[PDB]
Ligand binder design. Structure first.
Ligand SMILES: *[C@@H]1O[C@H](CO)[C@@H](O[C@@H]2O[C@H](CO)[C@@H](O[C@@H]3O[C@H](CO)[C@@H](O)[C@H](O[C@H]4O[C@H](CO)[C@@H](O)[C@H](O)[C@@H]4O)[C@@H]3O)[C@H](O)[C@H]2NC(C)=O)[C@H](O)[C@H]1NC(C)=O
Ligand SMILES: *[C@@H]1O[C@H](CO)[C@@H](O[C@@H]2O[C@H](CO)[C@@H](O[C@@H]3O[C@H](CO)[C@@H](O)[C@H](O[C@H]4O[C@H](CO)[C@@H](O)[C@H](O)[C@@H]4O)[C@@H]3O)[C@H](O)[C@H]2NC(C)=O)[C@H](O)[C@H]1NC(C)=O
Ligand SMILES: CCCCCCCC(=O)OC[C@@H](O)[C@@H](OC)[C@@H]1OC(C(=O)O)=C[C@H](NC(=N)N)[C@H]1NC(C)=O
Ligand SMILES: CCCCCCCC(=O)OC[C@@H](O)[C@@H](OC)[C@@H]1OC(C(=O)O)=C[C@H](NC(=N)N)[C@H]1NC(C)=O
Ligand SMILES: CCCCCCCC(=O)OC[C@@H](O)[C@@H](OC)[C@@H]1OC(C(=O)O)=C[C@H](NC(=N)N)[C@H]1NC(C)=O
Ligand SMILES: CCCCCCCC(=O)OC[C@@H](O)[C@@H](OC)[C@@H]1OC(C(=O)O)=C[C@H](NC(=N)N)[C@H]1NC(C)=O
Ligand SMILES: *[C@@H]1O[C@H](CO)[C@@H](O)[C@H](O)[C@H]1NC(C)=O
Ligand SMILES: *[C@@H]1O[C@H](CO)[C@@H](O)[C@H](O)[C@H]1NC(C)=O
Ligand SMILES: *[C@@H]1O[C@H](CO)[C@@H](O)[C@H](O)[C@H]1NC(C)=O
Ligand SMILES: *[C@@H]1O[C@H](CO)[C@@H](O)[C@H](O)[C@H]1NC(C)=O
Ligand SMILES: *[C@@H]1O[C@H](CO)[C@@H](O)[C@H](O)[C@H]1NC(C)=O
Ligand SMILES: *[C@@H]1O[C@H](CO)[C@@H](O)[C@H](O)[C@H]1NC(C)=O
Ligand SMILES: [Ca+2]
Ligand SMILES: [Ca+2]
Ligand SMILES: [Ca+2]
Ligand SMILES: [Ca+2]
Ligand SMILES: [Ca+2]
Ligand SMILES: [Ca+2]
Ligand SMILES: [Ca+2]
Ligand SMILES: [Ca+2]
Ligand SMILES: [Ca+2]
Lengths: 387, 387, 387, 387
């Protein structure tokens, strides 16, 4: 086994080829499939896995009742091979968690699972499934992390955590982790910024994270840093606003866009110089639809012009969280780090008249060969028999 | 790991010994078994797997409703060990796909999965589960491929794809693929021919494909080619017509037989000089029954005489698609490439009064020791509880 | 990997320690468990597996209807780790079969599966899951084999097959098989003998089989042979009669005991010089109960005295088939071949008012440390919901 | 593979970080989950597994009826990866057993499973799944063992067994086992002591066991010994009484505390010099709640003062058995033996109006980084459909 180098650049890509679809909710109508939310994908040098937060219950069973609820002692982080439904019969147990991150350094899996009370939550770090560290809430207000993969470079893995209000100034910390041990952390000096649920990826030995401002930004905040945790911060400038909810596209800002800025959804974007690939919902007001947009000056420019749009999920279909994942040269044999992404397709409450909330997933990888837009939605027929 | 040589000749065989039976539909009456169609078998140097197109739903569940439908965003290519039922608990995810092929070059699996809209479908190629190439519809009319294994020789794998009408002249291309990458393709110059759903196998370093003419042939078209994609084309001459539907046996043609020529079913045949092993339905009008026929001059001769017939499925039982698969010397230790075949046993719509359509499978391998004809049908009792 | 030597003697044992219990029928009341019968155990140098003939259906489903029937095209030989329930989710597919045998030579698994019509059945032999030979019915009257493990010595494996009447003189052949290929066979010259369902084990480089006389013997016939298939035949002499049905114990015979001799059950015994360990039902008239009896002169002596009796299943509980299996020094590290045995616990028809018939299993291994008699019965409560 | 050394000291710890939660009962409402009780965790150098005694039945099925019953021929010891629900689809079969222990010596698993009649039970010992020894009841009164992991040092593993009354003086033996073979045993000379269900761990080459006195002690008895089985005995002195039931905390005793001393629950404690980490229920009268208490002089001192309390399960929630497990340096890379523990969360009879009794589990590992108390209860809603 060898550490992932993480020193090559992100592969430029012209479109997105479909990689996986699990059909979890459709299958769970009969099969034994976990009620889940907050899924994400992460790869080792050998395989790619879907991680997810269970609700300690199965679809179409009474224990799925009330699963709109975000945090409980029953939620667990588990994983299964990409594209398979999350079932008790094919899933690896990772951690007890209502917020999580995970990533592979080339040698072993790092998992981070946060559980405990809202006023004193504890992140448990594991390396190869053995507890290696913990970090406890420092603001006593829902310690929370990425809900997507952490990022690794040369044996060090990096993540971001938040503690404090979701509707005002909070506290954001970056962590450097080696063999599951926190070896350095820094608090970001980001007055007037808000960071939640960062999607972080490696690119030329440094980490870029695109996150969710739940306080007052309808564009997405970003933070980038080197292995020594020297960081920079900003917001994506494009008038192609990335959050949900958001206003109709118009002139943007390199600071937080206040219009429709409260609340949000976990998302991601890939930076290429001044340009950016933005993944976003199609609806400006609800978690519906998904599309990928290439905006060649969208990282630093405020106009609402863009060059490419690719459909992923139709506007009349449910979407949800989305996040980046990468495939390193050690896995692919390429000379660059390949960008991929996943989308959570949320079914049930609050929009649908069920007793439960759960998601399925789709994923795509970037390529420079021909691609096509379409809609690959969840496809389940609600309500279910338990409803 | 070593590349399959693919340079020995096809083993001559006198009969077919039963190899597998999954009983998928019988078992799915209670168990958690995927609704599937278009199954096929393919082997590595170590094992044989059943590939199949799911409908993203389980048998005896409401989401099986309407599964007579051929293409949707929910269909996925998955695989499991040969003879096992396709379940979410034992199946490997391969690709999102409503048309597919797969084969192992001795090192890794190649999978090809076509998804997207009818007017712009995209084939996603994976090698060891990593996306390696794509090819997009060139006629904007249901890009489609084998629904059986591709064929590999010395590290190159080969397949055929079609784009265009199913009731008139279409476009047919041959592809050479190395480590999941298309390295060469050619369009077949086949005016008045129609090719779909080719069953292709290697034989002495060259590829032979026997396919389905849905336009105007009740005999089967074939195409054979070397590693440089220099090809020859024709139709099986035998008056023992191979397609379904078809006329009663009589004098055949080395061109497309127009009588009952429209429509068809995926099938296969094995060429041995002027002779041919033909697998076909027993019914001339419907997908019922299956038999293997040895016709010693049937490749090139038009008479309706034959030498051996072996029963596989009784005429009063449902059959469906069939296809070739081979076992290379690297797997068997033999000094020739062994021919095997599978049969899809289709249950449900349109012939039966159910809300769903799904198949089970049987397979056989060629031998020169004693064999026997019989009927190994699906055996499920319809309708099901859900109907 | 190395061939099993098979040259050490059978370990003498004073009692039987319980090794496994699967509770298949109890579990199948809810879980997805195959309807099975004719289970048996066989070991490699690394693990022990339960083989079984499915009925291509699950317990408590309508397709379990009529499963008292012995032969059909739906029956398949499959296997799972010892002690686990036979489910579609944990079972390896082996062969299509309504009669079977299997054994590991130290390198790979040999499986033998007989399918086809009663008047022309074909045994398909596989080595490492690849078809290596076939043998076809020579009397056109239900070709049939052990329903327990074959026996291996120095890279050669041995089995017995029968063809002909079950109520009169039939034909019995011994086979020597190497890497799945029949390299020698001989027909036993056994006028007035009847052999079915042999339980064969290796002992000092030679094979001993104890079988079922369905024609006219309530004691068990035996055949022993060396690697060159030079054989001897006889019947177990003990007045402790081994078959079911049978008379009450009395003076026995070294030939077939005619009293209650018609019909029978698959069983086994272990020879130790003049002595014998006999496994048998407790009831003389029905497949109820099970016990192990040590009779120190029972192989060659006709008296009805014995020295040890150990209870296995109570007389008021259902039993069924039983068979030997061994654990070689290559697996155990012992300096002798260890005798073990399994018992099939049959539930359903004809004795119970259900639509189905299925079995669970228990197994035991011989030891010289302390043991105890008890009853470890099936434990399912019939009828089931489907009945 | 290398033997565990077992020669380093127990890691001192300040708190307990949550390690696993299986949600078995919640999931078994729909999924195929074993009815179980007496679960425990044990690790190899590579992984940690949950062992458990099934009732040979699944949750929400009629065969779960009467499972309050402790011993039957249907109970089996099985195991699955830690944190996964115990299902027939993910569980390894270990032994037929209604009382058990297991542990890994660094090379292979030792399992001990006791079955048979109350008046003559037999413990079957397996090493790598092969029977290696047996030991039979010596007092003919429910031979019984730990229901948690045995302890290994330098290739020798150690356990404790009891035979005799649960309401008066019984007999207690210590065993030294090498490669599954009993190489030494001694009977403890413990008049007026009572030992059941010992929780034993290694610490500096010696074994410490903390057990259950069901006769007349509401504090816990202990026994410690070296590899030669030279032992010492006593009771935990702390006025923080460890058993359930028990009196309210007050001045304790270094002998058995008679007040509320009859009956009990399996538990554990970790000795650190004069100090002790005590895990106990929160209720003094019933199996409800769980907490960890650090009492710096509680091993040898009788006062009821303590320094740290950490909540694990709320007082209004069901708990049950608890036990120690360790993680050796060979697994963790640490320079000490890490203490962890599990808690069984018992649902059903006798406290709840169901036909069945079953448990789920949680586990924690000791650390010196920040931790938090909370309640991680079972969470199932009773009764179930079957009730
Ligand atoms: C699989 O699919 C088939 C086909 O969809 C499905 O059978 C259909 O069931 C639906 C719903 O029960 C039926 O739809 C009804 O049709 C009647 C006329 O026959 C209408 O009167 C009904 O409409 C009234 O009620 C609606 C709901 O309250 C109102 O919205 C509407 O305005 C009317 O007031 C309704 O449309 C339909 O008849 C059948 N179709 C067929 C061909 O049988 C089947 O149930 C599905 N199977 C499973 C397992 O899901
Ligand atoms: C799990 O076990 C419990 C306890 O066994 C079980 O509840 C029991 O159900 C049985 C069967 O329904 C009940 O037995 C009946 O009791 C009544 C008196 O209350 C008797 O009159 C009945 O006997 C008559 O009918 C029998 C059958 O026809 C005749 O054989 C008999 O001679 C009489 O004519 C019968 O015994 C019993 O009352 C309950 N017991 C309790 C405590 O509730 C439960 O059903 C089981 N659960 C599952 C899921 O299997
Ligand atoms: C807004 O009110 O609060 C801030 C959000 O960012 C946060 O909600 C607190 C998270 O929100 C959501 C959601 O679907 O939007 C899912 C998470 N669920 C989860 N990870 N279990 C929450 N995050 C948490 C930790 O609850
Ligand atoms: C008749 O219209 O001709 C064209 C067919 O050859 C084509 O149907 C378009 C294929 O047809 C068949 C079939 O059962 O006959 C199943 C496939 N289903 C499938 N592979 N998912 C189809 N092929 C596709 C790509 O739809
Ligand atoms: C008596 O009438 O016939 C001879 C028997 O030895 C034979 O039955 C034909 C076998 O009998 C039985 C049985 O439970 O007794 C199970 C088998 N079932 C099976 N292996 N599938 C049969 N054997 C066969 C091949 O049917
Ligand atoms: C009271 O009578 O004292 C003796 C107990 O300590 C003993 O019960 C005999 C064990 O008790 C307990 C329990 O939940 O308390 C479960 C076990 N169940 C089990 N391990 N299967 C029993 N132990 C056994 C061997 O029955
Ligand atoms: C990336 O890291 C690898 C592995 O250490 C190193 O060999 C290589 O020089 C680096 N690549 C570049 C482009 O600097
Ligand atoms: C969901 O939970 C609520 C709160 O306990 C309860 O009232 C209701 O019965 C539950 N609904 C279902 C369908 O179980
Ligand atoms: C087939 O290929 C193998 C492997 O390269 C080669 O050694 C051999 O010469 C070829 N066999 C024949 C018969 O040409
Ligand atoms: C058994 O076979 C082994 C392996 O070949 C051989 O070494 C040994 O001599 C034989 N044992 C006896 C007792 O003859
Ligand atoms: C069993 O099969 C018979 C014969 O077809 C049929 O009449 C009956 O309905 C079946 N019984 C059940 C319970 O399915
Ligand atoms: C513990 O055992 C190891 C392995 O044998 C040995 O090397 C070492 O000396 C021991 N450690 C201590 C602290 O005694
Ligand atoms: Ca926002
Ligand atoms: Ca722009
Ligand atoms: Ca045609
Ligand atoms: Ca001819
Ligand atoms: Ca007989
Ligand atoms: Ca005698
Ligand atoms: Ca089910
Ligand atoms: Ca007590
Ligand atoms: Ca104290």
């Amino acid at each position: 086994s060898v550490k992932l180098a993480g020193n090559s650049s992100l592969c430029p890509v012209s479109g997105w080829a479909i990689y996986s679809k699990d059909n979890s909710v459709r299958i769970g109508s009969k099969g034994d499939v976990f009620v889940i939310r907050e899924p994400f994908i992460s790869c080792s040098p050998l395989e790619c896995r879907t991680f997810f937060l269970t609700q300690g219950a199965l679809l179409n069973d009474k224990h799925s009742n009330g699963t709109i609820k975000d945090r409980s002692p029953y939620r667990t982080l588990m994983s299964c091979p990409i594209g398979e439904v999350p079932s008790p019969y094919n899933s690896r147990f990772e951690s007890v968690a209502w917020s999580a991150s995970a990533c592979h350094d080339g040698i072993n899996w790092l998992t981070i699972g946060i559980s405990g009370p809202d006023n004193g939550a504890v992140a448990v770090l594991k390396y190869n499934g053995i507890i290696t560290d913990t970090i406890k809430s420092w603001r006593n207000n829902i310690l929370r992390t990425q809900e997507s993969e952490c990022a690794c470079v040369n044996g060090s893995c990096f993540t971001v955590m938040t503690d404090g209000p979701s509707n005002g100034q909070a506290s954001y910390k970056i962590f450097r982790i080696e063999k599951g041990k926190i070896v350095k952390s820094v608090e970001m000096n980001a007055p007037n910024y808000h960071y939640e649920e960062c999607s972080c990826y490696p690119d030329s030995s440094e980490i870029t994270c695109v996150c969710r401002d739940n306080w007052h930004g309808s564009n997405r905040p970003w933070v980038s840093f080197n292995q020594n945790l020297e960081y920079q911060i900003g917001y994506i400038c494009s008038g192609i606003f990335g959050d949900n909810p958001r206003p109709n596209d118009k002139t943007g800002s390199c600071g937080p866009v206040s219009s429709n800025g409260a609340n949000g959804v976990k998302g991601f974007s890939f930076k290429y110089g001044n340009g950016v690939w933005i993944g976003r919902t199609k609806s400006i007001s609800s978690r519906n639809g998904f599309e990928m947009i290439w905006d060649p000056n969208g990282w630093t420019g405020t106009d609402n012009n863009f060059s490419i749009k690719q459909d992923i999920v139709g506007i009349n279909e449910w979407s949800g969280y989305s996040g980046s994942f990468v495939q390193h040269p050690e896995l692919t044999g390429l000379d660059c780090i390949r960008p991929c992404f996943w989308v959570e397709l949320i079914r049930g409450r609050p929009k649908e008249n069920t007793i439960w909330t759960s998601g399925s997933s789709i994923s795509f990888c970037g390529v420079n060969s021909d691609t096509v837009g379409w809609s690959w939605p969840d496809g389940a027929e609600l309500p279910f028999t338990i409803d």
